[PDB]
Design an enzyme around this catalytic site. Structure first.
Site, PDB file in Angstrom:
ATOM      1  N   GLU A 244       0.552  -1.388  -0.237  1.00 52.20           N
ATOM      2  CA  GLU A 244       0.158  -0.066  -0.126  1.00 52.20           C
ATOM      3  C   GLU A 244       0.586   1.027  -0.087  1.00 52.20           C
ATOM      4  OE1 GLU A 244      -3.643   0.097   3.686  1.00 52.20           O
ATOM      5  OE2 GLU A 244      -4.669  -1.286   2.224  1.00 52.20           O
TER       6      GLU A 244
ATOM      7  N   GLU B   9      -5.845  -8.629  -0.258  1.00 49.90           N
ATOM      8  CA  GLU B   9      -6.389  -8.216   1.009  1.00 49.90           C
ATOM      9  C   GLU B   9      -7.595  -7.823   0.515  1.00 49.90           C
ATOM     10  OE1 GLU B   9      -4.718  -4.727   3.241  1.00 49.90           O
ATOM     11  OE2 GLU B   9      -3.064  -5.730   2.953  1.00 49.90           O
TER      12      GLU B   9
END
Length: 481
Positions: free
Chosen positions: A171, A280
């Site tokens: 991320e 995720e």
């Protein structure tokens, strides 16, 4: 009027066995007090909870992500190797707790080996470096006489682990990630890490950080599209309203096809079959601390059920997928100092992983659909889905073509449904159906009721044409042939 039609004779595509992957981070009690609890009565030799270890083997995890999402961005893998005791105690900025680091690379690969999962490691692009990344790869894969290869041996582990999946940053787009970058910074960096790394070990698969910003993805695909193998996608949904929650499985659908098409738009990325890695994804709206111990109920389990069905039929563009976590942190398996408990999310996997084929077969369904508008994941981000089916399903066939699984999801609560299923040229067999549901859309398992929400078999006589009623908010797999 609903109705589904399967044709076992027509295979559509394979089902990437890696859609059922899981993730395990050093967040809260996912590792320490979860899969790992040194010197506990429930833990074994190497400190692995035996009770967790079973639950994990029972859903044959394909690949396991580690050491993290946010955590990894300030994690230096070398503090996790060598005898323990001498491993430095560091302070993790991500979730703000001390890392004893007694659970390191060696321990993770061991845990993987034990559960028969292919390790999926993600490097640190926050406080870490390219030299550091290379070394971790040297340490895990190659077999030369390079310093780090031998270090692996000196410590255990004379044979190279051969970690096949490498997450190239986490991320990195997020203002919350340690050392977060801009679209161009990360983009050009992803290429540098993947460029080398792959000169060292050509066989690895690289997953680049992707997200919801089109320009971000586009700039990543445009820069590293000739060397990365996937582009990461994270999906977290949730809401109190039953439908606002289950219906987002069809939002995730449009989202994935979205990213899919961006890839088609970058010549280099499209030429090589770069794909999507949904590394995720779970329900998450209730807890917003740094233990993240979300109390999943049947509602959420159905969503999970639906996602798996979706993936089942999209594994061609999203071959890799990882549930949020599988332990305490947004955990599928909740832990306690003295026990275990399986949440509806865990169940969804128990059901689909043990009752699913390796090939997707012409399967066509007809549902009443609906439209919806709701919120999502705790800031209640607004969203909307159009024509979400009340019933959906996917038919798989075993490798040896002698077994059929028709997984169906009735995403209605106030209703059971008596849809006429039909299987081209089946005949009369005595199939058995495993269905998963429970009391109400809010049922959940406890330490004393480890079975409120569970899977239950039942036998049936099936023919080329027949019927079977599916309970409200239920997920079923008719296992025939």
């Amino acid at each position: 009027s609903y109705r589904i039609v399967v044709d076992p004779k027509e295979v559509v595509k394979p089902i990437s066995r890696h859609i059922y992957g899981h993730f395990t981070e050093h967040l809260g009690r996912c590792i320490y007090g979860g899969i790992y609890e040194e010197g506990s009565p429930l833990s074994d030799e190497r400190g692995f909870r035996k009770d967790v270890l079973e639950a994990v083997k029972r859903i044959k995890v394909p690949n396991l992500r580690w050491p993290g999402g946010n955590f990894v961005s300030n994690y230096h893998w070398e503090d996790g190797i060598g005898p323990k005791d001498q491993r430095p105690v560091r302070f993790d900025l991500a979730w703000q707790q001390e890392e004893t680091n007694r659970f390191g690379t060696d321990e993770f690969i061991e845990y993987c080996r034990e559960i028969g999962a292919e390790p999926y490691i993600s490097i640190n692009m926050g406080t870490g470096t390219l030299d550091e990344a290379l070394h971790w790869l040297e340490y895990c894969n190659g077999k030369g006489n390079t310093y780090y290869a031998q270090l692996r041996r000196k410590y255990g582990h004379p044979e190279p682990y051969n970690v096949k999946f490498w997450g190239i940053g986490n991320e990195m787009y997020g203002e919350w990630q340690v050392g977060h970058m801009t679209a161009d910074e990360y983009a050009r960096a992803a290429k540098e890490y993947t460029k080398w790394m792959k000169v060292f070990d050509p066989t690895i698969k690289a997953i680049a950080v992707g997200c919801d910003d089109p320009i971000w993805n586009l700039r990543v695909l445009q820069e590293a599209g000739d060397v990365i193998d996937f582009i990461s996608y994270h999906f977290y949904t949730g809401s109190d309203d039953y439908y606002e929650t289950v219906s987002t499985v069809y939002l995730l659908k449009e989202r994935l096809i979205g990213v899919k098409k961006l890839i088609d738009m970058v010549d280099t990325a499209r030429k090589r079959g770069v794909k999507i890695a949904l590394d995720e994804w779970n329900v998450w709206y209730r807890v917003s601390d740094n233990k993240l111990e979300e109390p999943y109920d049947l509602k959420d389990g159905i969503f999970a059920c639906g996602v798996l069905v979706l993936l089942q039929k999209m594994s061609d563009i999203v071959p890799l997928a990882n549930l949020a976590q599988l332990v305490n942190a947004l955990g599928a398996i909740h832990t306690e100092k003295d026990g275990l408990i399986l949440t509806p999310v865990y169940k969804a996997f128990e059901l689909i992983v043990n009752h699913s084929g390796e090939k997707l077969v012409k399967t066509h369904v007809e549902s009443e659909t609906y439209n919806i508008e709701g919120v999502m994941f705790i800031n209640k981000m607004p969203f909307s889905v159009e024509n979400a089916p009340f019933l959906d399903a996917a038919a798989s066939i075993s490798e040896d073509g002698k077994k059929l699984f028709i997984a169906v999801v009735n995403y209605r609560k106030e209703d059971a449904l008596k849809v006429p299923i039909r299987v081209e040229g089946l005949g009369q067999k005595k199939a058995t159906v495993y269905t998963l549901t429970g009391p109400d859309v809010n049922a959940r398992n406890t330490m004393e009721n480890p079975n409120v929400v569970d899977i239950t078999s039942e036998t049936i006589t099936v023919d080329t044409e027949f019927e079977h009623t599916f309970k409200p908010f239920s997920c079923s797999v008719i296992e025939v042939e």
